[model samples]
Structure formats: structure tokens, C-alpha cells
Target: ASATFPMQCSALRKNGFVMLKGRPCKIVEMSTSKTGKHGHAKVHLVGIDIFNGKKYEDICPSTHNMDVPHVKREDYQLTDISDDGYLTLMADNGDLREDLKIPDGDLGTQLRSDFDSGKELLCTVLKSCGEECVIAVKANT
Candidate 1:
């Protein structure tokens, strides 16, 4: 596990981090309301699971502490897609990865189509909480 520092609840804004179902999630949006009588201010957050792309939400009192996950992003070039559906990618450091799962949904379909067309695409690999996923695809330059 990577080192993490506590983040104040007040700082939990969009593009920040939060813990959801024991996994570090990326906050997509957040809002805070004023404190009520004898009550702490409420923080409403919508987050997406960094690894699975699942949506999650939470409501907590402002001023509470939150766990922040160490996040990392890397770019890779699509080199090949094997017959078995494994993707072959080359990282910027010359490291090759052929065991990555093609992300599910239209993006996966697009990648497959691009590969069949003899085109290479750039991909973004996002890492958080010991989980990784290919989240973005762009035309190779």
C-alpha cells in the first residue's frame, strides 16, 4: 500500500479522493450544506470506483476526516490485441504489458475496431488503491 495523508472533509471536492466500500474512490462531485441546530454540516459526495467504474455516493458531516488514496496515471501505446482478447501495450519506459483486460463497454469495442483497422491508440492507465484500469483511449499521434 502507498502512504496516504488524511484529508479534511472540507477539502473533499470534485477530483478529490474518498473511501467507499473499503476502496479508495474518486470523487466526481461534492456539496456541503450548512450545519443544523446541534448538528454538523453535511457533505454529499458522488464518487466512481477507480478500478471498476462503479458509482457510489455518501453523506457525511463536514469537519470529519477522510482517507486519501495515492493516485497514478500512465500512458501506453496499443501494440497488439491477441486472439484471446488480451491487450499488448508498451509503456513509456519500454515496459510491455499483454495481460491487461480491455475495459468493458463501447470503449472496448472502439479499441477492437481501431486495432482491426490497423491503427494504434494511446491509452491511459489509472492506478489507485492497488487496482488499475485502462480508462481512456486517444488516436495515436
Candidate 2:
């Protein structure tokens, strides 16, 4: 199983990252409100999946504990792109990732364009929740 720790809902911040539903996501928005006069505060969170461009939302008590996965962000040099959109990346540790999803955003657009131009790109690989994925990309610098 993947390693993770329990964290209070209050610990999460906007723009912070977390693992939810077995996926790595960026906390896009957060709100806290009273659940009831006799109940604990409730937390509402909106997150975007780093790899699949999916959005996730959940609500929990502010004091409730949730599983936080061990996340690592590392740079990788783009080695190749397959016709089907899978990426070939060389991680800093020399491991090659052949199935990383091509992310969505300006970075994703640039990555595709650069590859077509015969340029290598640098990408940030977000590894957590038992999955490894690319979250951002940039031209080789």
C-alpha cells in the first residue's frame, strides 16, 4: 500500500496539494462554515486532479482527519512523445516514465508544440497516491 498520514481538514490551504480518491489534486478553493449549532464546523474543498483535468469536491468536519499521501515533485527531461499522447520522460533519478499523461493548460500546450519543434521540455512530475503523473511542463532551460 502507499504511505500516507492523517491530517486535519483545517490544515489544507488553497493552492496546496493533496491526495483524494486515490488521485493527486491541487486544492483550488476552500470554505469553512457551521454545520449546526450543536455540531462541528464543516469544510468544503474543491480540487483539480493534476493528471486528468478532473475536478473533485468534498465536505467534511473541520476537525475530521483525512488521509494525506506522501507527495513528491521532481523535474524530468522530456525524451519523446507517442502518437497517442503518452509522454516519455527521463526522471532526475534516471528512471524513465513512458505512460505519463499529457496534462492540460498552457504548459501542456507548450509541451506539445515544443516536441513538434524538436525541442526537449522540462516537466514537473507529481508522484503520490500510488500514481506518478506530470503536473507542469516548460521548455528545457
Candidate 3:
């Protein structure tokens, strides 16, 4: 029905927001910039859902991010091949979840291609919120 965690979505792996165990995904958007001595060169971008068209935003450095030691990547697999496809993922600490869907027609193909990798960062719980389903997550990302 709703997500019980918080997640900041981003395209940069080094800038934080790495998928689950920091794998099983392709970075969608990212930019690199270097600052002076006091500043730091950073990569910034938005993270794309490997399974759906959802896009996540940038996150803060440390706060609200995934905890280091306790953070473990969850596993997901396609339980059944249906008209829309069904996926079952093992929850990690019940922190986040991502419910994915796609538009009818060609979008279905797109969805299949996106999730073909069979892995994603379980960072939010998906729920229908009007015309579209909102994958509930911590919005810092």
C-alpha cells in the first residue's frame, strides 16, 4: 500500500544512490564537475529504473542514505511471465520497495527490456496513486 522507508534516487554511483548492492543497473544520467581545493569534484545525475520508466533524483551526502554495514542488496526474480510480467523480490530490512509498471502497447516491450536484467535496487514500495502508481520511497534521492 505504501513504502516504509526513504531513498534518494540518483544516476551517479559514486555520488551515492547505488542500486541495491551497487550493481544490476545501468546509470541513466550523470554529470561530473570539479571545484577548487575546499570543494570537491562531483558527479550528479538522476537514476533510472531498470524495470520501469521511473526516475529518481539526487540525494544528500550522508543523512537519509542507506546505512553502510546493515545495507544488503535484496534479490528479485520473475515469478511468472504474464501479459505484464510479475516480479517477486526479497525485502532487505523492510527499508524500501519499488513497484514497477508500464504503459500499454510498445511500452510493455520497453518495460521488459528495462527489467530484463532481473535486478534492481529495492528502494520503495509501489502503490496506485490515481492514474499512475507512486513507488513510495524516501524522496531525498
Ranking by lDDT: 1, 2, 3
- Note the Cα lDDT for every prediction shown: 0.81, 0.79, 0.37
lDDT value for candidate 3? 0.37
TM-score of each: 0.80, 0.70, 0.28
Q: Give lDDT tens digits, candidate 3, residues 30-94.
A: 66555566744444546554335466644333223432111223233322234544333334444
Q: How close is candidate 3 to the true structure, as a TM-score?
A: 0.28
Q: Over the stretch 1-141, how does candidate 2's per-residue lDDT look in tens digits?
A: 656777788888887776667666788988886666876887888888866769988777887887676778889899988888998889778999787867767777878887889776898887776677677777775
Consecutive 10-residue window with the lowest summed lDDT within model 2: 15-24
Prediction 1 global C-alpha lDDT: 0.81
Q: Cα RMSDs of all predictions?
A: 2.7, 3.1, 12.3
| Candidate number with greatest TM-score | 1
Selected candidate, larger TM-score, 2 vs 3 = 2
Residue 47, model 2, lDDT: 87
Which digits, one per residue and each the tens of the lDDT, describe model 1 over residues 36-124? 67968888878988777799887777777877888889989999888888888899898999978788889888888887896779988
**Model 2 stretches with alpha carbons more than 4 Å out:** 1-3, 19-22, 34-39, 104-106
